[PDB]
Design a protein around this nucleic acid. Sequence first.
DNA 1: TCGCGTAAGCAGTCCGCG
DNA 2: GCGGACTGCTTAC
Length: 901
Amino acid sequence: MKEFYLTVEQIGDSIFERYIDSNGRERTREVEYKPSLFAHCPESQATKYFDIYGKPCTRKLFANMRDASQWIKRMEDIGLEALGMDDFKLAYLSDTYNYEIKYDHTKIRVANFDIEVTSPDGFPEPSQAKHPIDAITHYDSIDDRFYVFDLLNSPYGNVEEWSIEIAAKLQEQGGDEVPSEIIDKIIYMPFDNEKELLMEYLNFWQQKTPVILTGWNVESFAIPYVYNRIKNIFGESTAKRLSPHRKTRVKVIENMYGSREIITLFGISVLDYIDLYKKFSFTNQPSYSLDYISEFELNVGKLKYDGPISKLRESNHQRYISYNIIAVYRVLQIDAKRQFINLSLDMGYYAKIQIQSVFSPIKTWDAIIFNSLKEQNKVIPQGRSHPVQPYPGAFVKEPIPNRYKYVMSFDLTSAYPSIIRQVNISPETIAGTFKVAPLHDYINAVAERPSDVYSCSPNGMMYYKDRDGVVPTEITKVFNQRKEHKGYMLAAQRNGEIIKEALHNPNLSVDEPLDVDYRFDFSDEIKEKIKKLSAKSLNEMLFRAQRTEVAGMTAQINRKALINGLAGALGNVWFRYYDLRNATAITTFGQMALQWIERKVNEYLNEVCGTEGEAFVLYGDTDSIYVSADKIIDKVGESKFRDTNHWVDFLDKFARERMEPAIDRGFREMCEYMNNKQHLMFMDREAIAGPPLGSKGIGGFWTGKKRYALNVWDMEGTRYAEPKLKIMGLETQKSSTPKAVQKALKECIRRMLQEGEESLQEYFKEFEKEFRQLNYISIASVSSANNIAKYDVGGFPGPKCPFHIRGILTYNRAIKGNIDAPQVVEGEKVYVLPLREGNPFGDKCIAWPSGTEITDLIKDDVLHWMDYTVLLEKTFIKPLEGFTSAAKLDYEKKASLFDMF
DNA sequence: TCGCGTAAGCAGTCCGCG
DNA sequence: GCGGACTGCTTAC
Ligand SMILES: Cc1cn([C@H]2C[C@H](O)[C@@H](COP(=O)(O)OP(=O)(O)OP(=O)(O)O)O2)c(=O)[nH]c1=O
Ligand SMILES: [Ca+2]
Ligand SMILES: [Ca+2]
Ligand SMILES: [Ca+2]
Ligand SMILES: [Ca+2]
Ligand SMILES: [Ca+2]
């Protein structure tokens, strides 16, 4: 097999590399790597190395990496560019793995661990590590075993051994319901004392040294706690055994409001799953506790226990250990679903970066572009300082707030990357500038043609047409990967809908789910077999289909995010290829393209409808248009349609056969107008929306920019078994809106779009009547909470104190003196409830950590004083009044006598 | 919230508006 | 009351 790296580090003048050799074995080596860097040289000086602008460079070979670094400094002192890859480990990987890397995940040691620490005096600070580590569960991917390290004797209590037999039993048997599929994979090691536990953990770690290290909050908690605790007990040299090169560094992570410390373990790649989740999941969650996320992702119940966590070990050590094991397994279950580890490996090996660098599109693209240019003996420019400067973005059309009955939407495939490729936008393809006219003059095709030589953007920039830039070339490669995976995603989605249909008529049989590849549209034979399956088998197939869809979604959307991140990186000052000329070339072309095609679509439709000046495009945002189809439907007549699916088909055909050719013609003209390198503006139909045939549903409404709802029957070629709501921006989509309120508002919208005004009025009346019985957590607002200290004036709110911050200060006063009470963590999320006047908390709201029950110290008083009236008006009624006035109906039946009878 | 971009919405504070 | 200036937070793209 081909060799591949596992990790790479620079330590002084050595590269330390862990890798898999040609026999599939893990090895480590220290290499005295001599880097090269570059300087411009005379034309007379024959060379094979050229910078990206074609200027000749001489290569400078250094005796060692420190000399290379010192040379860069002196070049700055002189005031000359020092060219080349200054991150020497990326250069090392480029030299050592000068081929497309084929990796084998089965050889990569992926470790998932979690620790427990009993603490009676509040949160156990990792930087102090003053409490014993009393449990570690460490799952190893190569062994496929859960290694459980259990402390039996502690200053906080001596306990009995954990019982695997009780752990396996149902909770209804008094057990812990540790999943049966992992029971035989548990290797249980009890310890008489903490020193022997930790010494054994370190010997184990030595034997089975993680390459990828993950878990939940491991980077911010478990790793620093373990490192500092071992440091406290044994000394630094022992703690550094967590690094295979015995090198560690305290790294200070800074943000706007403060900083925190992590421990960098050289020769390990830490991918904390909470951070993978935040980057790759495209959720915004009210809470990021593992319980909350597990429930959300897996539909597993919360891990239940009595009393505070600080007393769990002494009261119920059995459960204590079982929950530590389950916590590790839940992360593995989330990854089986979401596949973020697989994603990180793919992207990291593609770029030839340290795997942990997948968190950084700047680093990822820097490496991709360096490797690409190096192949041609081209030399990358030095990174430079730039002041941060604002620049313009996308165009968003102001919609007329209204109901909109029939809507067809269209948008560009990978808009910004497509613009890059079409215009040929790249650092080295800049050809010059032209004299810009107002944007509207380009939109209306009255401005002078910018160039007869070069490919142009309406921001004034011109680009070469003879050759693709490195940015277009490399962005195309990732886009193509994205496109492949999106194909699989949509296939699994469509396959999912076939199963849902078949589920209307399940067979009374005992059979099995079919063995199929859900990434490909089911053949006729598979469809026939599905129609004969039991509900049981169908449901199992649906679950598998949806898991395949999720896998495709992860692969596609994060490749989309990477290529989109390159367009954004051009506008970030730390990017080697930062250039506002290029960043604004993209966005300004985008603005033009949307408004150009709006004009073209309106023109086309006015022509087919025989009108003038009618606005068929009602909305657009960045790269999208929403087209009113009322007139199209009315031209055949609603009476002519057999059912909902009939007019959906008719609009689908109209979009494909009439609209899309019209749009394509519009964009080809624009391409020629801008003299672009290649026409790549592909604006495909997204959604077909409308009320159910014969209903009083309104179909859709807009309240304003970035705020709308549609009842969608077909989305990017997926024809739904049941209509689906596409809701953007409205309170149903915001993590700040209470859970039960999102649900209620969604049902109000459903009724509006599908059933009409009377149905809406029915539901509102019921919700208003019953909501006071909703669980307090389900009706609490949510907010991130920054700058708690800034607004805290002796325990009370200072000037301009935000409402949620006020809530926290109230909480802080109410729990004062308690070290055991849960603390609100700066920068994390809180639940927020309003309080009625005259309450014992002395203020109008209280807040507490999100994803948790409020402490029993004050729960009863919070419940008694909760202001349901304010809660209802603020979170439910106010948004609903916005929706209904926009859509021109009433959520309450207006008095129009009779009545009178 | 360490790790790519801008546009733009709503809640809430403070305070004017005769 | 509500709007504008402003801070804070969150979402669409
Ligand atoms: C979603 C998203 C979009 N954008 C910008 C770049 C996108 O090309 C542009 C349009 O957004 P989208 O239409 O969401 O995405 P897309 O056109 O890149 O991909 P698709 O083929 O799935 O439609 O908006 C970002 O800069 N960051 C983001 O997170
Ligand atoms: Ca725990
Ligand atoms: Ca798009
Ligand atoms: Ca599309
Ligand atoms: Ca059947
Ligand atoms: Ca779009």
